[PDB]
Amino acid sequence: VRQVSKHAFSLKQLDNPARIPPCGWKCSKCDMRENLWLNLTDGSILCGRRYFDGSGGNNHAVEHYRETGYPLAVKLGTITPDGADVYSYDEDDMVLDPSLAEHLSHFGIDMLKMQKT
Numbered sequence: 001v002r003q004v005s006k007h008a009f010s011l012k013q014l015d016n017p018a019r020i021p022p023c024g025w026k027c028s029k030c031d032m033r034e035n036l037w038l039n040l041t042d043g044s045i046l047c048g049r050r051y052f053d054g055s056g057g058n059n060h061a062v063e064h065y066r067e068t069g070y071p072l073a074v075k076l077g078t079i080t081p082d083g084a085d086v087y088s089y090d091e092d093d094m095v096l097d098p099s100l101a102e103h104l105s106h107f108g109i110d111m112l113k114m115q116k117t
């Protein structure tokens with residue numbers, strides 16, 4: 001392998017004061033509680049793409065990307081002190097965010113307190 005996102009150091013985050021718990025997240029837009037992605041620009045929590053067999057998510061995170069251009073999302077439940085799964089929609093890859101700890105702090109998340117799913 002994963003390479004540093006071209007957005008890791010230039011990302012401009014919006015001020016979103018909503019409290020984000022350490023576990024038991026929900027899609028803002030549906031019942032989903034798995035394949036939930038936190039968009040690092042706006043703090044939106046939304047579900048991953050639908051699988052070919054119609055399982056998986058309801059496309060809410062990717063729809064939000066197409067509407068906004070906000071490129072980086074981190075998969076809740078993968079955040080450890082060592083890192084997380086971060087996807088970049090405009091680079092179409094799993095990427096490194098060496099600023100991840102800051103990006104998550106901005107929305108009041110402590111990486112040392114999040115729980116592995």
Ligand SMILES: C[C@H](C(=O)O)n1cnc2ccccc2c1=O
Nearest residue numbers: 037047048049059061062073087
């Ligand atoms: C976050 C995003 C989604 O599901 O909305 N996502 C996540 N992982 C991927 C892995 C490979 C190819 C595409 C995606 C993707 O769109």
Ligand SMILES: [Zn+2]
Nearest residue numbers: 027030047060
């Ligand atoms: Zn959803």
